Paper text:
Introduction of R380 into bYFVES504 also resulted in more homogenous virions, allowing for its [name] to be resolved to a high resolution. The symmetry expanded local reconstruction method was used to resolve the [name] of bYFVES504 [name] to an initial resolution of 3.2 Å. To help elucidate all particle stabilising interactions that might be mediated by [name], the symmetry expanded map was further refined after a focussed 3D classification around the previously ill-defined icosahedral three-fold axis. This resulted in two final maps with the three-fold axis E protein in two discrete states, which we designated up and down. While the global resolution of these maps are similar to the previous, the three-fold axis E protein is well resolved in the down map, allowing accurate modelling of the E protein in all three positions. Residue R380, which is located on a non-surface exposed loop of E-DIII, makes contacts with neighbouring E proteins at three unique inter-raft interfaces. The five-fold axis E protein R380 residue makes two intermolecular bonds with the backbone carbonyl groups of D382 and R384 and the two-fold axis E protein R380 residue forms a salt bridge with E87. In the down conformation, the three-fold axis E protein R380 residue makes a bond with the side chain hydroxyl of T133, while this contact is not observed in the up position. The atomic model of the bYFVES504 [name] [name] was then compared with the atomic model of the bYFVES504/DIII17D [name] and was found to be highly similar (rigid body whole [name] Cα RMSD: 0.82 Å). Instead, we propose that the three inter-raft interactions mediated by R380 act together to lock the smooth mature virion structure, and that this conformational stabilisation propagates down to the dimer level.
[name] ([name]) is a re-emerging flavivirus that causes severe hepatic disease and mortality in humans. Crystallographic studies have resolved the structure of the [name] E protein and shown that its domain architecture is similar to related flaviviruses, with three N-terminal ectodomains, known as domains I (DI), II (DII) and III (DIII) and a stem anchor region known as the transmembrane domain (TM). Here we use a chimeric virus platform to resolve the first high resolution cryo-EM structures of [name]. Stark differences in particle morphology and homogeneity are observed between vaccine and virulent strains of [name], and these are found to have significant implications on antibody recognition and neutralisation.
Numbering used by the authors:
A (entry chain A), B (entry chain B), C (entry chain C): 1 to 391
The structure:
Amino acid sequence: AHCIGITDRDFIEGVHGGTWVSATLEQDKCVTVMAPDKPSLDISLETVAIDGPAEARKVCYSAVLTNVKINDKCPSTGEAHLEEENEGDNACKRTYSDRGWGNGCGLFGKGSIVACAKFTCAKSMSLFEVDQTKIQYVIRAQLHVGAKQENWNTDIKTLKFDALSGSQEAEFTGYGRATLECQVQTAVDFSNSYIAEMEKESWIVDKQWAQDLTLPWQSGSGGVWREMHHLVEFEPPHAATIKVLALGNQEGSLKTALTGAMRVTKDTNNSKLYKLHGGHVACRVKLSALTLKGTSYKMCTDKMSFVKNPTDTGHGTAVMQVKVPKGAPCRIPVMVADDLTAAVNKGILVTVNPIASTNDDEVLIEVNPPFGDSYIIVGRGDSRLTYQWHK
Amino acid sequence: AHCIGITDRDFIEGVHGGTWVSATLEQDKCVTVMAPDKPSLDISLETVAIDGPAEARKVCYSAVLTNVKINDKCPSTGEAHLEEENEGDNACKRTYSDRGWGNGCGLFGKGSIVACAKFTCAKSMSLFEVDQTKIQYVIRAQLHVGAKQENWNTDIKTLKFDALSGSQEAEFTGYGRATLECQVQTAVDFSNSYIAEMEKESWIVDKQWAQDLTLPWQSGSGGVWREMHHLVEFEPPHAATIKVLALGNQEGSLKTALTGAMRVTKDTNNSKLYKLHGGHVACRVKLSALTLKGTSYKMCTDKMSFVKNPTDTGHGTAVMQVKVPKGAPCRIPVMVADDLTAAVNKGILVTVNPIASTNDDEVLIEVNPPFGDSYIIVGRGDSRLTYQWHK
Amino acid sequence: AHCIGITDRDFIEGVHGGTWVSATLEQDKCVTVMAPDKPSLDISLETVAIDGPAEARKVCYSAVLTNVKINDKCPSTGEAHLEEENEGDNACKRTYSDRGWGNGCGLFGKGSIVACAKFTCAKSMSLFEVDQTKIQYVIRAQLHVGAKQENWNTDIKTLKFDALSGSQEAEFTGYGRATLECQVQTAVDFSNSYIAEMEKESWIVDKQWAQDLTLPWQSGSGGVWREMHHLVEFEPPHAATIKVLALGNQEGSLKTALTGAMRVTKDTNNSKLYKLHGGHVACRVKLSALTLKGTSYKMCTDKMSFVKNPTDTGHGTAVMQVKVPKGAPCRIPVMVADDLTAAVNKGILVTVNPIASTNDDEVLIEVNPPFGDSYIIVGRGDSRLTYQWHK
């Protein structure tokens, strides 16, 4: 019952017959869906992911200007030039200096200076495109067979999806089968956004934001960086010198903007998987094909005992564990009542027909008792167990 | 006259006699000072040097965070512990986590969790206290003797104003002496500030700002880093685990905050001299002890020549060089006239009395011609040089 | 019949259908359960306990500051540090002192000073976290066999329970057996608390209160104390000196807060056991398997005598002890009548069928006389003991 452990649990109540029940899931939340006689079904998300998204940009946030040269010409001697100015790895600026006799010229007009510097990205973001059609989904499903928690880790059923895959069927030994539609494409519309990756961290952010970044960037595998001035200061030109300086590591400013984004976690082993949080889904549940097991076994009579008392899940339910020490595969009766007379059950039972699978067996039960005080009763008979519960 | 070569130049005229004159000097700029019968003096502020600061703080802008450890305890089994928390260099944080029957406990309350990791400073900024007793103001002074531009740097006098040398005497060969008072005590407000130094760039910064930085720091002599929570962030705990992530390198953000501070350049030679950019100082000039070297001389009447023609420095003054190949102890007649008949002189000479003193002497002359059309006339008789001018 | 010894006694009565009777047992009170046709039961809550709580915090109420070191620096020579400041068992404070030539400092102004002292707890309050699942309790049961007060502790049955021993059976020789089924406690009053222990005094305290105490604390594994500044007082600096003094022993203030808490007591022999006062336990009693020992026996006729004359219990009942010196394997006829025509036993007998069993047996009888005047009567004609009793 994986749904016991997730704080955001929702309960959905259904109807009999050949019918579907609607549900919606979020990556941190779980639904228990219940229906008049079907064993109740737990459903949660497990991942939303893209596999091998395609490179779309690199954006540079630290650069080294490895060498620099200047050319300068007197005010009447025309425009200055440097052969580096036409070579793609060099950031170059043209501007006019204050020439004169003090600086080695015959005339006092404005002179011409060019400054060029060899660029090199030290560290850069990789921006990856997400094809909204290629996203992958995984759903967890369970029925309350009444298994102990030491068993959940194997009983849990994993339903894998992609945005193109159809409704899928789950098989539970004995209880039969279910089918879920999950129309994921109506939930997530992450087109017009893309994955921004940085060393050991990643985000998803809007493309129009990223294109508008005032940082130098590269259009693909190799080739020149395209807006180099966004990382290079050229000082106001002196007589024949322009000090050029790199603007320093912009990792911290870039992270500051990303703080609002939905996070992305790179898979530790299937290296090219990128798990994408926040994305929800809508699903509809074919409850009709489930069945209870063992409806026709005998009801218990043995002197049962608690393995753990009822405890408040915070979902409003009480979860409890019981054992039949020396019985056949008997049905374990349970009810909630206003008084020891117990003339009727007055509560809702999540586990619908708990059965001892073996002669020594231990079983889990969960109940949703009404408001106020009520007596939880298990083992209707002379040798009743009870716990005086309160909301 | 080095101020022919500085693009921001002001003119000041003393009432009479060189009695007492005032100026404000700013690092980019120069003042030319005139008086009715005394040689003109060029004054400018060369540098404002601060000598031998002492360290106050280092502020770390990029921490590498290592050897993370976590400990967590079941939701009603007391509170967490790590030995690493005894050590001042681990940035440990303590909180609570959702727990439940599927996550290692009998209860559904909140389990205490604590996580520690070692904060190592990869790069840090040095803040220095500035000794306001050790500020040196350097003024350059030279006369308009008529020296050619190759010689200006050997004619210039350099005067240094520490807090004690409040009045200084400029001496010139033959032209007498001039006294400068520079009011260092009212020039800057250093006491409430620190030198901030990053690698090969430095700033002078307000002390309140430097201390109110939300960024982790260490005492000048070393020891412990005091405010590590400003760079170490802890993501909200999953059931059994908490991930700690270092915030990025803040260099670009720190420089962005510094976009308003006055830059300071460290000396290549004296490893503890710091030269402030953009300072100013109020100064006063006593001209009364200057003399004009050659008022006793004869007039020229020989075949003079232009080594450099009058050229238009943007100050609106015409600068020329005349060579006097014959009569040596002689004065050059210069006038600017509205017509070649030379009926009146319409230009102030800045070189107040251009004397030759060898049979080959080359004398720079600067004239302030009137608005409209005029003739710069140098010489007498038939050997005159006459040059047309226009504002 | 130990209900006699407990002042806060309630009577509860059965109905001839033999239904379970439910009763509320509270730590100072006692209950006599009377059946219509079967012997009456003393039932009373003896203890409620936790066996070995979980150690959660020690909080310090008396402290000593065993070693003190101070460091001071001049106003323009940086900021002071100490090796102790890196070392976790030192409490530390940083501030500034007014320096000047009067204390060896060359510049007048505020100078940084820092002081550190070794914290050491002399007495700490232990706080143990209570866990409802570990609560234990004990009920005492005793039928009104008629035994001497001197024989009660030999004859009472002590019934132990825990959260999982669902029901217990009490066996009374000859009279048969009864079974109790119980809530481990109804006492939700203990929720969200700690057991607080000082030397030989203990209390139950709200978790919020205990954690918000302005006193330094540590986790039970032996950490280092987390808020030492609550007990170190730092004198304002004077030259190079700070005096640090320990704020005094807080035992009385902490006790003054604790006066409202429910008391907790520690066992003398099994020191992990804390007896938690003030609880409510609810139980059901199965009366059906009780029986009356001697209903077939002869009815007394030899002269009885009073060992203790009838006396007022304060519960409205009267108690006597009677001696049967001959013929003793025989029923003692006791009745309360309106007058010596002895028409009917207008009273209710709590000792439902007093039998003597040995040739000099002495038997206690408890009667509930009617309102108004009455005669207590025991025996048969010409041999009746009688005693006037008025409400």
